[PDB]
């Protein structure tokens, strides 16, 4: 297993910021050999945008992931299927995601769609939950890529995201290969949310 702790800042309408503390861990599914990486950082830049042609609730994502501080499956563009099932304070909803993943430049292009109507939480609060095996590792660090070395069997991603002064998401994710497309199947349970706090009140400015 490996661990990462980070805090995402979300801008609010009233100028203030909403903080999202992340506890993340990853566990290989396969019973085989994996790499135990030293401390290293993942530097993520990430932009969100809209398809103007899409009438459904959606989020376009462009992301560049790069490390600083059993892999051949990624030598090129891998397809991605993402499926999230969540309920937040009893709100049942699903997000479906398609796109490509090029590990060679640490770039992800994915478009996500709310399958069940209106998304009951702001899309930014679901970004860090909605495939870090695509992050580009330099060659002096090619040995510290846990994610790739757990493939195609995959790994389990488990993360609790608590929003200060508000509720918390608890997600479970299976990130594996499924017939030469990479899949992220995720459950998400949010509890104890203020029914008109930043999240359920939809008070987050939309970018990140």
């Amino acid at each position: 297993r490996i661990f990462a702790i980070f805090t995402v800042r979300h801008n609010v309408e009233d100028g203030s910021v909403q903080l999202a503390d992340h506890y993340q861990q990853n566990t290989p599914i396969g019973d085989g050999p994996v790499l135990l990486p030293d401390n290293h950082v993942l530097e993520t830049q990430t932009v969100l945008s809209k398809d103007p042609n899409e009438k459904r609730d959606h989020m376009v994502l462009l992301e560049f992931v790069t490390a600083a501080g059993g892999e051949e499956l990624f030598t090129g563009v891998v397809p991605i299927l993402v499926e999230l099932d969540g309920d937040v304070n009893g709100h049942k909803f699903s997000v479906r995601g398609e796109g490509e993943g090029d590990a060679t430049i640490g770039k992800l292009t994915l478009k996500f769609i709310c399958t069940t109507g209106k998304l009951p939480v702001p899309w930014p609060t679901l970004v860090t939950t909605l495939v870090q095996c695509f992050s580009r590792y330099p060659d002096h660090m090619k040995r510290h890529d846990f994610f790739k070395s757990t493939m195609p069997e995959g790994y389990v991603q488990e993360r609790t995201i608590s929003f200060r002064d508000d509720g918390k998401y608890k997600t479970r994710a299976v990130v594996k290969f499924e017939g030469d497309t990479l899949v992220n199947r995720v459950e998400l349970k949010g509890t104890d949310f203020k029914e008109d706090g930043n999240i359920l009140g939809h008070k987050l400015e939309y970018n990140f």
Partner: peptide, 9 residues
Amino acid sequence: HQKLVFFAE
């Protein structure tokens, strides 16, 4: 922009 520190069990 964000950087993320990954540990080890």
